[PDB]
Nucleic acid binder design. Structure first.
Length: 49
DNA sequence: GGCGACCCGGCGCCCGCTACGGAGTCAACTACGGGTAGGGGGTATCGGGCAACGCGGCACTGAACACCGTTGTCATGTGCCTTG
């Protein structure tokens, strides 16, 4: 949960560079993990409710 | 000396189903004694295979009577002829 100083200046049509793709993957993997954990927590909440 | 944090234990859980891999593993010994269990051996008991022989309808046995039907049969009555 930090921010980079040099944000991605390229669109997916032009295509990201190497480091741009890497620093995007940094957030993509975290998003997938968050989705999994939120799904589990929502299921448990539904059961309790 | 009850409050107090803090500390610690101790516990409680941690979406849904299908469908989707195998793998399987390190250190005694003998003597006895019985008893059960197996085997064959022999034996009392139960189960399977055949013609008379139970029946029954009727059928024959007609035999021996019965049931009408029949032409046997008889002694006894009309009609004509002869004589009172």
């Amino acid at each position: 949960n930090e921010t980079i100083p040099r944000p991605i200046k390229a669109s997916f049509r032009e295509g990201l560079s190497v480091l741009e793709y890497f620093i995007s993957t940094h957030g993509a993997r975290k998003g997938l993990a968050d989705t999994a954990l939120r799904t589990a927590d929502s299921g448990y909440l539904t059961r309790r409710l």
